[PDB]
């Protein structure tokens, strides 16, 4: 039993010397790195083109349908008078009706197909307002039933004006929306020698009055549905490569599962020979757990990628996350091979022995960090653009700790020095104390912990 | 006496083993953390909505009343000709008179109510100028009595033009102001299921000629007064939770005060048994001082929060500071529980033993920092936007020390290289010497001090 | 043989004491530093002027020929309607025809000279479209032969309108281009007392429809061909200095080659006397390899500079790279002289002994870095402007590691929090984990390695 | 002699115990710190107001006289067509003539007074062009005599149009300038209770054609001459405080000079008693050299400040530099008092013993830094806005070393990836290698040197 246990923990070179068995797993892992990386690169190159097509079409729609729109104004684009709102709505509808003769793109109309469109209707112009709304600020009185009523006007696309009678219920208006769909063909595909696919853009223009604040923001959003074109005509490798990736990962998974099973069996035998828990876990190869996880992630992502490229699936985000995480894991796995050489193993072991104390110090530091997050959010959120939400506060503080965006953070508060002196003084104390504590003490202690770990490894 | 003293300094686990008393204080502190954090989160979520409502209304007012206003121009918005100023004033008044038929919001006029409005007056247009002003730059002569005279024109809101005869005394003009109030109802409250409240915005538009420089900046400011609406009609938990918070903190305060009293009594007995000062202070639990302070802050802030939510108080800033500081303190207090475990206590003790030498080094560094602040303010303030005031200078230098906003600081001075060579050379010397000294020596010494403290703790 | 070997490894001072030979090489290296730096400075000063001339002319062309152009809009300048595109094209051609009477510069027309211009034609207006294109998004049908057909209209410059009949094939349009050349004389040369040279600017205006997305970007580019003017008349040192530089570097190269040859001969003799590889390499003077490389680079760059200044060559980039790299190398070579003094040699030796472990740690860190690069590119590239390409991803991550541009990176993802919650959560995990791992562990270990190297050198 | 030498090197407390002499110098230094800081603060507060007045007047002039000017366009404001240039010139002159009826400021005209104005002329409009200029780019021919001829038109201010016949020699034009003077009174002074002073603004508008590039930049500059108004009338402390400062610094200078003289005499006696150089220098009190320098600088700056405040001097820059440097020095001098306490002296001595090795390492690092500066300037200057000049290159590299403005530096080169692949690859290599070398090795070694100095001091 002792000889088998000694062989189990041998290095790959020692194992080969002892038994001369073929190191299939190592070469398989190298091939897996190569093929997984190539697949990720090809997938990303393909996806960037579709992203660009959708973005360009959406920008063109913003320039076509939003009255007075200019680049960079998305966050502040809003109406402020009744005539401005009416003009924006009518301009959007008129541009929709004039699209064939003015657009640089080639778009087809879509009619019907369920709500909010009636049969034969291409554009839906809907206003949503409270069922009953009486607002008398002069008497400080109001009587509102907050049930939302929707009233829609249906516009049919022109054959190649009732909507002008729209009357908005301003005092009880919740929002106005314009919905329509446009079909186009993505000719850009021919650059990559692909067959062009057929896009349906669902366009929603929102005039939002939920704040009831006298300012109505205006936005345009699109959702793209992609299909194979019914009759494509332009005067294999990808699917085969995906199959190769799947087979490689399946073989790797089988071999790693076999190794883990043998490890478990040897662990049980050794435990029996002795007639704790960490001693048992010493038999587990964490690198093989990592490889099995990467194999599962890659197989799932590749199946999803095959589905997406056939236009049967649209879950780009999940596929990308699976493939990217698996690629990260397989690239991290390379460190195992470096661990077999002493000069690299010393550094890897330095990090490994440092990690526990670093995590304990993180436990100590996290409570202070959270206290600062909450305090900053409650006090500075009303006045500081970077403190509006807790996640934003955490991002700001984390960036400050690493010496980024500090002066602008200080400068945003200079406007309130005369307005609210107490708030400005508190912000001074808060920012200075936080930055000093975290940069000059916490980071120094992280450096000291790593240095001590290195010293103990080297001696 | 020795047994009681030994029991006094026992850890909570040791205390429980020795006497098996109920650890009410510990569970109470955990509950306090939870409830205080929840209260802060709810208060912040409620306050953000009101902040947003006020901000949106103010932006809408800027777009409605300021001629030619656009987003982002607040700092530079100004008039430069007499006709520009007249047009801006008249546009503001005309928009005030036309508000009912053009605004997307629903506003009611307010009349009278004291100065600067007469009875029945909705808008006050006042010009302030020197009592006697004679300015003859051709003869380098002037005769001014700097007493300020105010002349106001009162405009009544329309029933649902004397102000056009305004004649500005340009050569002696101090400023022009437009004051008016608008009442509205905050319907947005219905999103959070709250009852809408009644807002009165006090709007002040200032055309400022204090510099007498040929450039007159124009600004709009608002102050919001919030009341319960007299007759609200929409087709408990908060107050009870605030009461629960107050009771929890009162119980914690009583227990901590009892512990501190027992500590004082034991200290007196021990001193008597011996028939210095720090030896006496060794009997004081600093964590309990922190807990008592947090309890007091939280109780005060919760009372103010109850007052504010009933529209009897408007001191949002003080309440927010109290609650945020108390939350920070209670979250910091968690470190006491970590001190009871050796592996975390080593790190906490490292920071504690480092602190004194760090403070002494800060004493050494502060005088150099202040000298640089004064020198930079006096020399570069005329030329550099980031050196206008001493607080701004301190913010700039502190950001530079942490590697932020450095290149822009250097680049601002590139314009003066040809204008004033001496100033540019001095700025080069100043910035390079400051940054090098503070980054490559001071920060390195902070790191060295922390490392030495860690080494001495570990050995 | 032992005495000769001892003399070979002696320091320059020891060598001079032993034999009193003239230290020609050292003084030659000092002179080389001086002359090479002076040559680089003069070359850069001369090149900046031509760069500025070309840039100013190009900006003027953008203002002259691009309808509605303004500074800062280069990246977003685009057309969105058919009439916008027609107006832009016609405006460019009309401005070309009106240039003599409106331009502030002095330009001459160029006719003929090969494609795309016919004989006597000054301007070429060409549209490129697919040979056969039928696109029916209504039926999800298309029939395209992607062979590109070019149709050009030739405009002759006016004597000191068929192009108005242009009909664009919008549905199959690939792009539109406008080509023309303008000749000018660079009078600015007189500032530096140089003789003005004759420029020919080749101007290309592109209206790009490759994306077929409804948005057509518009760009203007120039290529400058510089010649000696045929008959210049304005009412030596450079060539001589270049010759001096070449001679200095040739002498240095000869001396260094002699030293390397003697080193090789002594190495062979010592090997023979012993009747490994690194032992042999110990005889090689790396500083002399550096000096020989710098001499070769400088001689090549100086020949190219002579050719360029005579208008016989236009390879500015290669010449600049050669001269700059050689200057960097010669300035780096100064460290050799510092190595001869103990107090500087300790620091140099600290860096030298640290380098190997630093490189091994870089091997360990690079795989993690690459995994993060790939994962970030695939997942965040669709949503984040800084993750579009792999090189951009590497730049972003490298900047994040050094505490730059962090908050903006976090803020770019705040828009997708509501759109795609999964992507936003993944981005949070990705960014936080990457930054924490690389700043708080990797950089700390680099510091620890350098500190250990310094400690071992000092003891 | 031994007792006197021992007393000489005693600390102030030891000196007082030994002889009980009055420590006048110490209290005098404290008073000096106080009064010098107060003087600097008052001077800076006074200077900021004048700076603001001049800046506001200049901005108003830009809005008044520059056709189509808007804030933020100073760097790019330029003309591109002949009609644009004519319109800008005529608009400036017409606004000058209409100033009394349109300006919000109160300005008086200035006539005559030497060149460029004739007697009775308020505005001078001058074009400068080459004496002989023939430019024929069609034939690649030119004949230029570069002697500059100036032709001026004189406009008299209106009494409360020949300039319209201006014909510009475009092909030989060097520049166009408009010169005029405006007198105003600074009423803003009344805010600080000062007596208003009389300003004369000299306004120069330049249309610059030196590049001959088809783009003519337009700029406006002002120079302010300040006088006491002849007959001021508005319905001491500063001079007395300046005198007090001068007396305090004179007394401090006398005492420090006496101490230095006694040190020199004791050094000579000790040298004589022994019947090297650094041993002699050990007798010199560097803090007293610093105090003497600060006294001299403060006295000079205070005399200049007195002159300036009386309107007899206008050298604000030199006065500010003197006073700021003296304030910095006096604040730095406080460290001497901290050196007398052991716990602060250990840190001060750590920095002192670290300084030499840090300077030697700086010698080693500077040559590499300079090589990189030259290489980057020559190679990337044509393409990168941050590499235009050597000082700008140094600022950029220094900021990069400290982790600032890194991603934007990388991003500026992304445009040239397709244009010039070789340059982009070189920029990648250059930036990555520089940043890595300087952050991961050089800064780490600075940290190691400081840590070693601290360790040797502590042991
Ligand atoms: C659970 C399912 C298991 C499937 C695999 C069953 C086939 C099978 O045993 O192959 C042996 C080798 C294994 O290749 P590989 O895994 O590289 O080789 C093993 C490892 O070196 C292992 O060390 P660690 O990796 O450190 O644990 C070692 O203990 C084993 O020695 P031992 O056997 O004496 O205990 C080796 O056999 O593989 C091939 O030669 C490729 C052909 C694969 C054919 C499968 C086609 C699907
Ligand atoms: C000044 C006013 C005092 C008010 C409290 C008086 C009631 C009272 O003694 O309760 C005992 C425990 C204390 O709970 P708690 O404070 O957790 O328990 C004490 C701590 O463990 C203390 O250690 P340190 O915290 O390290 O100092 C220890 O020395 C005491 O032992 P000793 O007594 O033998 O000296 C413990 O009694 O509390 C309850 O069991 C909850 C019921 C609270 C009822 C109050 C309702 C308002
Ligand atoms: C391969 C072609 C070689 C060309 C040079 C042949 C002429 C020639 O030997 O000059 C001797 C000295 C060398 O000057 P230089 O190179 O400075 O001097 C040598 C170095 O000090 C060398 O040390 P390292 O540099 O550390 O290796 C040392 O070993 C040699 O001693 P040794 O000779 O006893 O072995 C020295 O002669 O140079 C002149 O005195 C300038 C006149 C140059 C005339 C060349 C005009 C073109
Ligand atoms: C070169 C011109 C010298 C002018 C000063 C001549 C007057 C004069 O000796 O005053 C003695 C003290 C000095 O005050 P102060 O300088 O503070 O005192 C001296 C320092 O403590 C000095 O130590 P270090 O500072 O470390 O070198 C020490 O060696 C001297 O002892 P010793 O004398 O036994 O050698 C002290 O006399 O000063 C006053 O009591 C104020 C009245 C100043 C009156 C001056 C009005 C203008
Ligand atoms: C052993 C205790 C020593 C305490 C030293 C504290 C020094 C405080 C200086 C604060 C400067 C900001
Ligand atoms: C023991 C004293 C040694 C002093 C060494 C100073 C070196 C100065 C170099 C300055 C480079 C900027």
JSON list of N, CA and C in Angstrom, two decimals, chain D residues 396-427:
[
{"chain": "D", "resi": 396, "resn": "UNK", "atom": "N", "xyz": [4.38, 63.71, -18.90]},
{"chain": "D", "resi": 396, "resn": "UNK", "atom": "CA", "xyz": [3.58, 62.51, -19.18]},
{"chain": "D", "resi": 396, "resn": "UNK", "atom": "C", "xyz": [4.21, 61.27, -18.56]},
{"chain": "D", "resi": 397, "resn": "UNK", "atom": "N", "xyz": [5.52, 61.10, -18.73]},
{"chain": "D", "resi": 397, "resn": "UNK", "atom": "CA", "xyz": [6.19, 59.92, -18.18]},
{"chain": "D", "resi": 397, "resn": "UNK", "atom": "C", "xyz": [6.17, 59.93, -16.66]},
{"chain": "D", "resi": 398, "resn": "UNK", "atom": "N", "xyz": [6.40, 61.09, -16.05]},
{"chain": "D", "resi": 398, "resn": "UNK", "atom": "CA", "xyz": [6.36, 61.19, -14.60]},
{"chain": "D", "resi": 398, "resn": "UNK", "atom": "C", "xyz": [4.97, 60.86, -14.07]},
{"chain": "D", "resi": 399, "resn": "UNK", "atom": "N", "xyz": [3.92, 61.33, -14.75]},
{"chain": "D", "resi": 399, "resn": "UNK", "atom": "CA", "xyz": [2.56, 60.98, -14.34]},
{"chain": "D", "resi": 399, "resn": "UNK", "atom": "C", "xyz": [2.30, 59.48, -14.51]},
{"chain": "D", "resi": 400, "resn": "UNK", "atom": "N", "xyz": [2.78, 58.89, -15.60]},
{"chain": "D", "resi": 400, "resn": "UNK", "atom": "CA", "xyz": [2.60, 57.46, -15.80]},
{"chain": "D", "resi": 400, "resn": "UNK", "atom": "C", "xyz": [3.26, 56.66, -14.69]},
{"chain": "D", "resi": 401, "resn": "UNK", "atom": "N", "xyz": [4.46, 57.07, -14.27]},
{"chain": "D", "resi": 401, "resn": "UNK", "atom": "CA", "xyz": [5.16, 56.36, -13.21]},
{"chain": "D", "resi": 401, "resn": "UNK", "atom": "C", "xyz": [4.32, 56.30, -11.95]},
{"chain": "D", "resi": 402, "resn": "UNK", "atom": "N", "xyz": [3.52, 57.34, -11.69]},
{"chain": "D", "resi": 402, "resn": "UNK", "atom": "CA", "xyz": [2.70, 57.43, -10.49]},
{"chain": "D", "resi": 402, "resn": "UNK", "atom": "C", "xyz": [1.26, 56.99, -10.74]},
{"chain": "D", "resi": 403, "resn": "UNK", "atom": "N", "xyz": [1.02, 56.25, -11.81]},
{"chain": "D", "resi": 403, "resn": "UNK", "atom": "CA", "xyz": [-0.29, 55.68, -12.07]},
{"chain": "D", "resi": 403, "resn": "UNK", "atom": "C", "xyz": [-1.39, 56.67, -12.40]},
{"chain": "D", "resi": 404, "resn": "UNK", "atom": "N", "xyz": [-1.08, 57.68, -13.21]},
{"chain": "D", "resi": 404, "resn": "UNK", "atom": "CA", "xyz": [-2.07, 58.68, -13.60]},
{"chain": "D", "resi": 404, "resn": "UNK", "atom": "C", "xyz": [-2.09, 58.84, -15.12]},
{"chain": "D", "resi": 405, "resn": "UNK", "atom": "N", "xyz": [-3.30, 58.98, -15.67]},
{"chain": "D", "resi": 405, "resn": "UNK", "atom": "CA", "xyz": [-3.49, 59.30, -17.08]},
{"chain": "D", "resi": 405, "resn": "UNK", "atom": "C", "xyz": [-2.90, 58.22, -18.00]},
{"chain": "D", "resi": 406, "resn": "UNK", "atom": "N", "xyz": [-2.99, 56.96, -17.58]},
{"chain": "D", "resi": 406, "resn": "UNK", "atom": "CA", "xyz": [-2.34, 55.88, -18.32]},
{"chain": "D", "resi": 406, "resn": "UNK", "atom": "C", "xyz": [-3.22, 55.38, -19.47]},
{"chain": "D", "resi": 407, "resn": "UNK", "atom": "N", "xyz": [-4.50, 55.11, -19.20]},
{"chain": "D", "resi": 407, "resn": "UNK", "atom": "CA", "xyz": [-5.35, 54.56, -20.24]},
{"chain": "D", "resi": 407, "resn": "UNK", "atom": "C", "xyz": [-5.54, 55.54, -21.39]},
{"chain": "D", "resi": 408, "resn": "UNK", "atom": "N", "xyz": [-5.67, 56.84, -21.09]},
{"chain": "D", "resi": 408, "resn": "UNK", "atom": "CA", "xyz": [-5.81, 57.81, -22.17]},
{"chain": "D", "resi": 408, "resn": "UNK", "atom": "C", "xyz": [-4.55, 57.86, -23.01]},
{"chain": "D", "resi": 409, "resn": "UNK", "atom": "N", "xyz": [-3.38, 57.70, -22.37]},
{"chain": "D", "resi": 409, "resn": "UNK", "atom": "CA", "xyz": [-2.14, 57.62, -23.13]},
{"chain": "D", "resi": 409, "resn": "UNK", "atom": "C", "xyz": [-2.15, 56.44, -24.08]},
{"chain": "D", "resi": 410, "resn": "UNK", "atom": "N", "xyz": [-2.60, 55.27, -23.61]},
{"chain": "D", "resi": 410, "resn": "UNK", "atom": "CA", "xyz": [-2.71, 54.12, -24.49]},
{"chain": "D", "resi": 410, "resn": "UNK", "atom": "C", "xyz": [-3.74, 54.35, -25.59]},
{"chain": "D", "resi": 411, "resn": "UNK", "atom": "N", "xyz": [-4.86, 54.99, -25.26]},
{"chain": "D", "resi": 411, "resn": "UNK", "atom": "CA", "xyz": [-5.97, 55.13, -26.19]},
{"chain": "D", "resi": 411, "resn": "UNK", "atom": "C", "xyz": [-5.65, 56.11, -27.31]},
{"chain": "D", "resi": 412, "resn": "UNK", "atom": "N", "xyz": [-4.84, 57.13, -27.03]},
{"chain": "D", "resi": 412, "resn": "UNK", "atom": "CA", "xyz": [-4.48, 58.08, -28.08]},
{"chain": "D", "resi": 412, "resn": "UNK", "atom": "C", "xyz": [-3.81, 57.39, -29.26]},
{"chain": "D", "resi": 413, "resn": "UNK", "atom": "N", "xyz": [-3.12, 56.27, -29.02]},
{"chain": "D", "resi": 413, "resn": "UNK", "atom": "CA", "xyz": [-2.42, 55.56, -30.07]},
{"chain": "D", "resi": 413, "resn": "UNK", "atom": "C", "xyz": [-3.30, 54.56, -30.81]},
{"chain": "D", "resi": 414, "resn": "UNK", "atom": "N", "xyz": [-4.50, 54.27, -30.32]},
{"chain": "D", "resi": 414, "resn": "UNK", "atom": "CA", "xyz": [-5.35, 53.28, -30.98]},
{"chain": "D", "resi": 414, "resn": "UNK", "atom": "C", "xyz": [-5.78, 53.72, -32.38]},
{"chain": "D", "resi": 415, "resn": "UNK", "atom": "N", "xyz": [-5.75, 55.03, -32.66]},
{"chain": "D", "resi": 415, "resn": "UNK", "atom": "CA", "xyz": [-6.15, 55.50, -33.99]},
{"chain": "D", "resi": 415, "resn": "UNK", "atom": "C", "xyz": [-5.13, 55.14, -35.05]},
{"chain": "D", "resi": 416, "resn": "UNK", "atom": "N", "xyz": [-3.85, 55.07, -34.69]},
{"chain": "D", "resi": 416, "resn": "UNK", "atom": "CA", "xyz": [-2.78, 54.81, -35.64]},
{"chain": "D", "resi": 416, "resn": "UNK", "atom": "C", "xyz": [-2.52, 53.33, -35.86]},
{"chain": "D", "resi": 417, "resn": "UNK", "atom": "N", "xyz": [-3.29, 52.44, -35.23]},
{"chain": "D", "resi": 417, "resn": "UNK", "atom": "CA", "xyz": [-3.06, 51.01, -35.41]},
{"chain": "D", "resi": 417, "resn": "UNK", "atom": "C", "xyz": [-3.20, 50.62, -36.87]},
{"chain": "D", "resi": 418, "resn": "UNK", "atom": "N", "xyz": [-4.23, 51.13, -37.55]},
{"chain": "D", "resi": 418, "resn": "UNK", "atom": "CA", "xyz": [-4.41, 50.84, -38.96]},
{"chain": "D", "resi": 418, "resn": "UNK", "atom": "C", "xyz": [-3.56, 51.71, -39.86]},
{"chain": "D", "resi": 419, "resn": "UNK", "atom": "N", "xyz": [-3.38, 52.98, -39.47]},
{"chain": "D", "resi": 419, "resn": "UNK", "atom": "CA", "xyz": [-2.58, 53.90, -40.27]},
{"chain": "D", "resi": 419, "resn": "UNK", "atom": "C", "xyz": [-1.13, 53.44, -40.35]},
{"chain": "D", "resi": 420, "resn": "UNK", "atom": "N", "xyz": [-0.45, 53.39, -39.21]},
{"chain": "D", "resi": 420, "resn": "UNK", "atom": "CA", "xyz": [0.96, 53.00, -39.14]},
{"chain": "D", "resi": 420, "resn": "UNK", "atom": "C", "xyz": [1.10, 51.88, -38.11]},
{"chain": "D", "resi": 421, "resn": "UNK", "atom": "N", "xyz": [1.12, 50.64, -38.60]},
{"chain": "D", "resi": 421, "resn": "UNK", "atom": "CA", "xyz": [1.23, 49.50, -37.70]},
{"chain": "D", "resi": 421, "resn": "UNK", "atom": "C", "xyz": [2.57, 49.49, -36.96]},
{"chain": "D", "resi": 422, "resn": "UNK", "atom": "N", "xyz": [3.65, 49.85, -37.65]},
{"chain": "D", "resi": 422, "resn": "UNK", "atom": "CA", "xyz": [4.96, 49.85, -37.02]},
{"chain": "D", "resi": 422, "resn": "UNK", "atom": "C", "xyz": [5.00, 50.82, -35.84]},
{"chain": "D", "resi": 423, "resn": "UNK", "atom": "N", "xyz": [4.46, 52.02, -36.02]},
{"chain": "D", "resi": 423, "resn": "UNK", "atom": "CA", "xyz": [4.47, 53.01, -34.95]},
{"chain": "D", "resi": 423, "resn": "UNK", "atom": "C", "xyz": [3.63, 52.54, -33.78]},
{"chain": "D", "resi": 424, "resn": "UNK", "atom": "N", "xyz": [2.47, 51.93, -34.06]},
{"chain": "D", "resi": 424, "resn": "UNK", "atom": "CA", "xyz": [1.62, 51.45, -32.98]},
{"chain": "D", "resi": 424, "resn": "UNK", "atom": "C", "xyz": [2.29, 50.34, -32.19]},
{"chain": "D", "resi": 425, "resn": "UNK", "atom": "N", "xyz": [2.93, 49.39, -32.88]},
{"chain": "D", "resi": 425, "resn": "UNK", "atom": "CA", "xyz": [3.64, 48.33, -32.18]},
{"chain": "D", "resi": 425, "resn": "UNK", "atom": "C", "xyz": [4.78, 48.89, -31.34]},
{"chain": "D", "resi": 426, "resn": "UNK", "atom": "N", "xyz": [5.53, 49.85, -31.90]},
{"chain": "D", "resi": 426, "resn": "UNK", "atom": "CA", "xyz": [6.60, 50.47, -31.13]},
{"chain": "D", "resi": 426, "resn": "UNK", "atom": "C", "xyz": [6.05, 51.18, -29.90]},
{"chain": "D", "resi": 427, "resn": "UNK", "atom": "N", "xyz": [4.91, 51.86, -30.04]},
{"chain": "D", "resi": 427, "resn": "UNK", "atom": "CA", "xyz": [4.33, 52.55, -28.89]},
{"chain": "D", "resi": 427, "resn": "UNK", "atom": "C", "xyz": [3.91, 51.56, -27.82]}
]
